[PDB]
mmCIF file with all atom_site columns, N, CA and C in Angstrom:
data_model
loop_
_atom_site.group_PDB
_atom_site.id
_atom_site.type_symbol
_atom_site.label_atom_id
_atom_site.label_alt_id
_atom_site.label_comp_id
_atom_site.label_asym_id
_atom_site.label_entity_id
_atom_site.label_seq_id
_atom_site.pdbx_PDB_ins_code
_atom_site.Cartn_x
_atom_site.Cartn_y
_atom_site.Cartn_z
_atom_site.occupancy
_atom_site.B_iso_or_equiv
_atom_site.pdbx_formal_charge
_atom_site.auth_seq_id
_atom_site.auth_comp_id
_atom_site.auth_asym_id
_atom_site.auth_atom_id
_atom_site.pdbx_PDB_model_num
ATOM 1   N N  . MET A 1 1  ? 112.831 128.252 124.362 1.00 0.00 ? 1  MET A N  1
ATOM 2   C CA . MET A 1 1  ? 114.246 128.455 123.958 1.00 0.00 ? 1  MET A CA 1
ATOM 3   C C  . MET A 1 1  ? 114.348 129.006 122.540 1.00 0.00 ? 1  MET A C  1
ATOM 4   N N  . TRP A 1 2  ? 114.679 128.132 121.597 1.00 0.00 ? 2  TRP A N  1
ATOM 5   C CA . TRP A 1 2  ? 114.836 128.509 120.205 1.00 0.00 ? 2  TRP A CA 1
ATOM 6   C C  . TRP A 1 2  ? 113.854 127.732 119.331 1.00 0.00 ? 2  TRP A C  1
ATOM 7   N N  . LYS A 1 3  ? 114.267 126.541 118.908 1.00 0.00 ? 3  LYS A N  1
ATOM 8   C CA . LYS A 1 3  ? 113.424 125.673 118.097 1.00 0.00 ? 3  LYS A CA 1
ATOM 9   C C  . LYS A 1 3  ? 112.768 124.653 118.994 1.00 0.00 ? 3  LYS A C  1
ATOM 10  N N  . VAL A 1 4  ? 113.389 124.484 120.146 1.00 0.00 ? 4  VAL A N  1
ATOM 11  C CA . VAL A 1 4  ? 112.960 123.540 121.142 1.00 0.00 ? 4  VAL A CA 1
ATOM 12  C C  . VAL A 1 4  ? 111.451 123.493 121.293 1.00 0.00 ? 4  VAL A C  1
ATOM 13  N N  . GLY A 1 5  ? 110.813 124.659 121.266 1.00 0.00 ? 5  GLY A N  1
ATOM 14  C CA . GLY A 1 5  ? 109.379 124.713 121.440 1.00 0.00 ? 5  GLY A CA 1
ATOM 15  C C  . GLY A 1 5  ? 108.671 123.597 120.723 1.00 0.00 ? 5  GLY A C  1
ATOM 16  N N  . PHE A 1 6  ? 109.090 123.330 119.502 1.00 0.00 ? 6  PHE A N  1
ATOM 17  C CA . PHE A 1 6  ? 108.498 122.258 118.738 1.00 0.00 ? 6  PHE A CA 1
ATOM 18  C C  . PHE A 1 6  ? 109.554 121.239 118.344 1.00 0.00 ? 6  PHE A C  1
ATOM 19  N N  . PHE A 1 7  ? 110.750 121.385 118.909 1.00 0.00 ? 7  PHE A N  1
ATOM 20  C CA . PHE A 1 7  ? 111.845 120.479 118.601 1.00 0.00 ? 7  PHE A CA 1
ATOM 21  C C  . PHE A 1 7  ? 112.015 119.393 119.648 1.00 0.00 ? 7  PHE A C  1
ATOM 22  N N  . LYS A 1 8  ? 111.948 119.772 120.915 1.00 0.00 ? 8  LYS A N  1
ATOM 23  C CA . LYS A 1 8  ? 112.121 118.808 121.988 1.00 0.00 ? 8  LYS A CA 1
ATOM 24  C C  . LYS A 1 8  ? 111.079 117.697 121.908 1.00 0.00 ? 8  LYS A C  1
ATOM 25  N N  . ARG A 1 9  ? 110.107 117.885 121.021 1.00 0.00 ? 9  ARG A N  1
ATOM 26  C CA . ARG A 1 9  ? 109.066 116.900 120.790 1.00 0.00 ? 9  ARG A CA 1
ATOM 27  C C  . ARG A 1 9  ? 109.290 116.286 119.413 1.00 0.00 ? 9  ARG A C  1
ATOM 28  N N  . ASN A 1 10 ? 109.962 117.061 118.568 1.00 0.00 ? 10 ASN A N  1
ATOM 29  C CA . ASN A 1 10 ? 110.280 116.656 117.206 1.00 0.00 ? 10 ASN A CA 1
ATOM 30  C C  . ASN A 1 10 ? 111.642 115.971 117.141 1.00 0.00 ? 10 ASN A C  1
ATOM 31  N N  . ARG A 1 11 ? 112.693 116.774 116.982 1.00 0.00 ? 11 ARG A N  1
ATOM 32  C CA . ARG A 1 11 ? 114.054 116.255 116.896 1.00 0.00 ? 11 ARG A CA 1
ATOM 33  C C  . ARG A 1 11 ? 114.156 115.181 115.815 1.00 0.00 ? 11 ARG A C  1
ATOM 34  N N  . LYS B 2 1  ? 122.159 124.909 123.595 1.00 0.00 ? 1  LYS B N  1
ATOM 35  C CA . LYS B 2 1  ? 121.302 124.415 122.487 1.00 0.00 ? 1  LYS B CA 1
ATOM 36  C C  . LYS B 2 1  ? 121.598 122.984 122.095 1.00 0.00 ? 1  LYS B C  1
ATOM 37  N N  . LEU B 2 2  ? 122.381 122.295 122.891 1.00 0.00 ? 2  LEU B N  1
ATOM 38  C CA . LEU B 2 2  ? 122.682 120.917 122.585 1.00 0.00 ? 2  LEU B CA 1
ATOM 39  C C  . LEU B 2 2  ? 122.043 119.995 123.609 1.00 0.00 ? 2  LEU B C  1
ATOM 40  N N  . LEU B 2 3  ? 121.096 120.552 124.359 1.00 0.00 ? 3  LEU B N  1
ATOM 41  C CA . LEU B 2 3  ? 120.357 119.793 125.355 1.00 0.00 ? 3  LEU B CA 1
ATOM 42  C C  . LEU B 2 3  ? 119.334 118.922 124.644 1.00 0.00 ? 3  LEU B C  1
ATOM 43  N N  . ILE B 2 4  ? 119.168 119.203 123.357 1.00 0.00 ? 4  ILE B N  1
ATOM 44  C CA . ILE B 2 4  ? 118.235 118.482 122.510 1.00 0.00 ? 4  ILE B CA 1
ATOM 45  C C  . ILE B 2 4  ? 118.865 117.191 121.984 1.00 0.00 ? 4  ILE B C  1
ATOM 46  N N  . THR B 2 5  ? 119.827 116.669 122.740 1.00 0.00 ? 5  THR B N  1
ATOM 47  C CA . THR B 2 5  ? 120.511 115.436 122.371 1.00 0.00 ? 5  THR B CA 1
ATOM 48  C C  . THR B 2 5  ? 120.321 114.375 123.451 1.00 0.00 ? 5  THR B C  1
ATOM 49  N N  . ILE B 2 6  ? 120.204 114.823 124.700 1.00 0.00 ? 6  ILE B N  1
ATOM 50  C CA . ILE B 2 6  ? 120.009 113.913 125.822 1.00 0.00 ? 6  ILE B CA 1
ATOM 51  C C  . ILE B 2 6  ? 118.694 114.210 126.542 1.00 0.00 ? 6  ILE B C  1
ATOM 52  N N  . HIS B 2 7  ? 118.364 115.495 126.664 1.00 0.00 ? 7  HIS B N  1
ATOM 53  C CA . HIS B 2 7  ? 117.130 115.903 127.322 1.00 0.00 ? 7  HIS B CA 1
ATOM 54  C C  . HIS B 2 7  ? 115.938 115.579 126.432 1.00 0.00 ? 7  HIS B C  1
ATOM 55  N N  . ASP B 2 8  ? 116.196 115.481 125.132 1.00 0.00 ? 8  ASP B N  1
ATOM 56  C CA . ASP B 2 8  ? 115.155 115.154 124.172 1.00 0.00 ? 8  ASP B CA 1
ATOM 57  C C  . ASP B 2 8  ? 114.813 113.673 124.264 1.00 0.00 ? 8  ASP B C  1
ATOM 58  N N  . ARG B 2 9  ? 115.692 112.919 124.918 1.00 0.00 ? 9  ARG B N  1
ATOM 59  C CA . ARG B 2 9  ? 115.489 111.489 125.103 1.00 0.00 ? 9  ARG B CA 1
ATOM 60  C C  . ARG B 2 9  ? 114.469 111.248 126.205 1.00 0.00 ? 9  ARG B C  1
ATOM 61  N N  . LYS B 2 10 ? 114.241 112.282 127.002 1.00 0.00 ? 10 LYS B N  1
ATOM 62  C CA . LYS B 2 10 ? 113.283 112.216 128.099 1.00 0.00 ? 10 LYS B CA 1
ATOM 63  C C  . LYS B 2 10 ? 112.032 113.010 127.745 1.00 0.00 ? 10 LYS B C  1
ATOM 64  N N  . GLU B 2 11 ? 112.211 114.027 126.906 1.00 0.00 ? 11 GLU B N  1
ATOM 65  C CA . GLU B 2 11 ? 111.108 114.857 126.461 1.00 0.00 ? 11 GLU B CA 1
ATOM 66  C C  . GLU B 2 11 ? 110.218 114.062 125.514 1.00 0.00 ? 11 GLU B C  1
ATOM 67  N N  . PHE B 2 12 ? 110.630 112.824 125.255 1.00 0.00 ? 12 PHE B N  1
ATOM 68  C CA . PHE B 2 12 ? 109.908 111.924 124.369 1.00 0.00 ? 12 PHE B CA 1
ATOM 69  C C  . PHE B 2 12 ? 109.373 110.724 125.145 1.00 0.00 ? 12 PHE B C  1
ATOM 70  N N  . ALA B 2 13 ? 109.970 110.471 126.306 1.00 0.00 ? 13 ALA B N  1
ATOM 71  C CA . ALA B 2 13 ? 109.560 109.356 127.148 1.00 0.00 ? 13 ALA B CA 1
ATOM 72  C C  . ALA B 2 13 ? 108.387 109.741 128.041 1.00 0.00 ? 13 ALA B C  1
ATOM 73  N N  . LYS B 2 14 ? 107.382 110.364 127.437 1.00 0.00 ? 14 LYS B N  1
ATOM 74  C CA . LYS B 2 14 ? 106.180 110.769 128.153 1.00 0.00 ? 14 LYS B CA 1
ATOM 75  C C  . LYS B 2 14 ? 105.379 109.527 128.505 1.00 0.00 ? 14 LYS B C  1
ATOM 76  N N  . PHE B 2 15 ? 105.004 108.815 127.459 1.00 0.00 ? 15 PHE B N  1
ATOM 77  C CA . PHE B 2 15 ? 104.267 107.570 127.564 1.00 0.00 ? 15 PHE B CA 1
ATOM 78  C C  . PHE B 2 15 ? 105.176 106.463 127.064 1.00 0.00 ? 15 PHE B C  1
ATOM 79  N N  . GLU B 2 16 ? 106.249 106.903 126.422 1.00 0.00 ? 16 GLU B N  1
ATOM 80  C CA . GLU B 2 16 ? 107.256 106.021 125.873 1.00 0.00 ? 16 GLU B CA 1
ATOM 81  C C  . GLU B 2 16 ? 107.972 105.267 126.989 1.00 0.00 ? 16 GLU B C  1
ATOM 82  N N  . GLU B 2 17 ? 107.973 105.855 128.184 1.00 0.00 ? 17 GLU B N  1
ATOM 83  C CA . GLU B 2 17 ? 108.602 105.231 129.341 1.00 0.00 ? 17 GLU B CA 1
ATOM 84  C C  . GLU B 2 17 ? 107.677 104.162 129.914 1.00 0.00 ? 17 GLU B C  1
ATOM 85  N N  . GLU B 2 18 ? 106.492 104.066 129.324 1.00 0.00 ? 18 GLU B N  1
ATOM 86  C CA . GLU B 2 18 ? 105.491 103.092 129.742 1.00 0.00 ? 18 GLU B CA 1
ATOM 87  C C  . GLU B 2 18 ? 105.121 102.186 128.572 1.00 0.00 ? 18 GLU B C  1
ATOM 88  N N  . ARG B 2 19 ? 105.607 102.549 127.388 1.00 0.00 ? 19 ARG B N  1
ATOM 89  C CA . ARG B 2 19 ? 105.324 101.802 126.171 1.00 0.00 ? 19 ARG B CA 1
ATOM 90  C C  . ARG B 2 19 ? 106.542 101.004 125.704 1.00 0.00 ? 19 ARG B C  1
ATOM 91  N N  . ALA B 2 20 ? 107.688 101.672 125.613 1.00 0.00 ? 20 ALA B N  1
ATOM 92  C CA . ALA B 2 20 ? 108.919 101.027 125.168 1.00 0.00 ? 20 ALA B CA 1
ATOM 93  C C  . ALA B 2 20 ? 109.856 100.748 126.333 1.00 0.00 ? 20 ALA B C  1
ATOM 94  N N  . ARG B 2 21 ? 109.351 100.927 127.543 1.00 0.00 ? 21 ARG B N  1
ATOM 95  C CA . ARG B 2 21 ? 110.137 100.681 128.744 1.00 0.00 ? 21 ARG B CA 1
ATOM 96  C C  . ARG B 2 21 ? 109.601 99.468  129.479 1.00 0.00 ? 21 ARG B C  1
ATOM 97  N N  . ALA B 2 22 ? 108.339 99.535  129.886 1.00 0.00 ? 22 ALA B N  1
ATOM 98  C CA . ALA B 2 22 ? 107.711 98.430  130.596 1.00 0.00 ? 22 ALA B CA 1
ATOM 99  C C  . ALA B 2 22 ? 107.932 97.108  129.868 1.00 0.00 ? 22 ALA B C  1
ATOM 100 N N  . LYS B 2 23 ? 108.241 97.187  128.575 1.00 0.00 ? 23 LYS B N  1
ATOM 101 C CA . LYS B 2 23 ? 108.500 95.992  127.782 1.00 0.00 ? 23 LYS B CA 1
ATOM 102 C C  . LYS B 2 23 ? 109.613 95.182  128.422 1.00 0.00 ? 23 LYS B C  1
ATOM 103 N N  . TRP B 2 24 ? 110.758 95.828  128.582 1.00 0.00 ? 24 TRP B N  1
ATOM 104 C CA . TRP B 2 24 ? 111.919 95.208  129.192 1.00 0.00 ? 24 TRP B CA 1
ATOM 105 C C  . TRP B 2 24 ? 111.981 95.580  130.664 1.00 0.00 ? 24 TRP B C  1
ATOM 106 N N  . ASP B 2 25 ? 111.039 96.420  131.070 1.00 0.00 ? 25 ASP B N  1
ATOM 107 C CA . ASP B 2 25 ? 110.962 96.899  132.443 1.00 0.00 ? 25 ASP B CA 1
ATOM 108 C C  . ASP B 2 25 ? 109.681 96.416  133.118 1.00 0.00 ? 25 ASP B C  1
#
């Protein structure tokens, strides 16, 4: 997607 | 782009659903 790549694990 | 509010709650429950779940589950 956008930041999700490392965000859906980060957030 | 706001799926990272509820879907992220599952994208984290990889082992968390067996670590912080089995506790009360």
